[PDB]
Amino acid sequence: SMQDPIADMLTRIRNGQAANKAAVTMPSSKLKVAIANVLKEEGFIEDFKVEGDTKPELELTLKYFQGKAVVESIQRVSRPGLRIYKRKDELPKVMAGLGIAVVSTSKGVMTDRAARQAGLGGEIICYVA
Amino acid sequence: MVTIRLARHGAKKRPFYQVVVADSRNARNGRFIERVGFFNPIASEKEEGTRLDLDRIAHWVGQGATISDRVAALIKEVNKAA
């Protein structure tokens, strides 16, 4: 079954970028929408929309720069099999700060840099590069 | 009996004493309740060579701890110095 819906979204992004698709769609959820906001604010995707009321569909427009995918690697870190939680002083930085790690803190999901600046730790959703 | 005495540390021929409060039954370098200073009998000039936390000494003496004669001499010398 679909035990990990967040990983499903990342995989759709990864496979769609590999297949040079203009946009990708997936069933929505507030956690997915909250991650998509972080991706857009960090410039890894162009834009996103939510469509429908009874079965909301989330749609992300992917992003290319030199006919190349902006998201080079995007991997799930905390997974249902093994949850990962970091304290404020252990928040990872990916690609020496060039990328981002999405961290869910008590104040909503944000990037590792923002959470570090806000002095919080939390669950590590994924690494984006 | 709680007592305040010197535990001999340092190297051969260069004694360095740790002023410690401890139960009288334990070994000289054995388990101690608290460390309250140090004494250096070989210290050169411009080195203090003797530091005691007088407040802690007073606290423990008020609880009834005895004082070794050597550390009693140190207290008097320090109180004379300042």
């Binding site: 720069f65 190349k68 080079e72 690609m95 020496a96 060039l98 | -």
Partner: protein, 156 residues
Amino acid sequence: ELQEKLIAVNRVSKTVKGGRIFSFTALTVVGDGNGRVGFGYGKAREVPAAIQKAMEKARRNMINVALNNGTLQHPVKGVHTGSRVFMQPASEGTGIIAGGAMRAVLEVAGVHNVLAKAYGSTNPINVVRATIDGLENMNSPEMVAAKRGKSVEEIL
């Protein structure tokens, strides 16, 4: 100004009807010491012809690497076939710490300070291919900011 190093020479055989025919291979790496490094293979009957064929091939087939003051921008992993290579930046004065095949390519490319490790097969031909591939797949703050549509400090 291009700097060139012979990494490995090997003697191969063909086993023709009359017997074994022996020929030699070379492995060479050339670089400008300032971010351009290429490798050539080179194969010939005699060792001098082999090393010469390799160097000429290496002068072309050369790529550019976004170096950072003689050091890597960020940790990178490179895998060719059975060799997996890990290289991460280090502080000035650390030296180039790496296996022999990686040592030559990093020296010639101009990476003065790197910590490196080779996992899997250490076959020189594939190790060099894997480290070059890893170095090319290493982006810089300006190009990542341009790609992400922001400024450098906004990325920091």
